[PDB]
């Protein structure tokens, strides 16, 4: 509950702070700023640097709570999908230290968040449904993985030859007009994909040529020239009157 954790945040940062030497619940507040404020969509790496502070403060801690004190940040590494601290977290001993079975789950969570194949992902969707039990937000964690895997598939299929029929480039998703047209138009609107789609004849055509400084730099500097000549118009209107 994020507004309950928000009233508890505004009580924490001065009331728990009004209890002397708290190096214990301040890391709890770090996990809270990594789940509430990443649930406030701040940034992967700011909240994940608070997970870094949490990851270097999760030691000398009892086993059935340190067996689940890495579930948030590693199912957030499932959220991240630019995991960026494999080499520090999961090569590190806190994912290679404990006796229980949940760290044995986080081992394959780590290796799958290193590899990320569809042949592993859509097949272990049923093997990780009991690991979707420990998913606090059922959208973003898997949605960054598969909604990245959208354009992963697209650069696997659209890349080798530019213009194409829409129907056979959409045969590998089997929908012709539902969301892949919106995704490719969205990558036009995000400039990951430079071309023109179709609905009449169903012919996608990729091409681009933006930069002409012969036009751009010249004419915009002439606009600045005209502004400067307007600035000389008062030398003119001053010598006249």
């Amino acid at each position: 509950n994020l507004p309950k954790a928000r009233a508890a945040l505004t009580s924490a940062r001065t009331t728990a702070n009004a209890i002397y030497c708290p190096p214990k619940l301040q890391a709890t507040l770090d996990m809270q700023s990594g789940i509430i404020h990443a649930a406030e969509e701040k940034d992967w790496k700011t909240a994940y640097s608070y997970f870094y502070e949490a990851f270097e403060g999760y030691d000398s801690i009892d086993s059935p709570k340190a067996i689940t004190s890495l579930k948030y940040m590693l199912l957030c590494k499932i959220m991240l999908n630019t995991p960026e601290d494999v080499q520090a977290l999961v090569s590190g001993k806190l994912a290679l230290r404990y006796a229980g079975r949940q760290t044995e789950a986080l081992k394959c969570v780590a290796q799958a968040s290193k590899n990320r194949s569809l042949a592993d992902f859509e097949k272990a969707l049923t093997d990780y449904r009991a690991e979707l039990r420990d998913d606090p937000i059922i959208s973003t964690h898997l949605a960054k993985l598969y909604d990245n895997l959208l354009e992963q598939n697209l650069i696997r299929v659209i890349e080798p030859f530019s213009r194409v029929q829409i129907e056979h480039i959409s045969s590998l998703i089997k929908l012709s007009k539902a969301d892949v047209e919106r995704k490719l138009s969205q990558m036009i609107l995000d400039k990951k994909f430079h071309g023109i789609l179709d609905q009449g004849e169903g012919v996608l055509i990729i091409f681009d040529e933006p930069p002409v400084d012969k036009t751009y730099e010249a004419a915009l500097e002439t606009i600045q020239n005209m502004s400067k000549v307007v600035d000389s118009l008062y030398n003119k209107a001053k010598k006249l009157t």
Partner: peptide, 10 residues
């Protein structure tokens, strides 16, 4: 800016 051969049905 999506594309060109658009309609009023889609």
């Amino acid at each position: 800016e999506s594309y060109r051969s658009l309609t009023l049905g889609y």
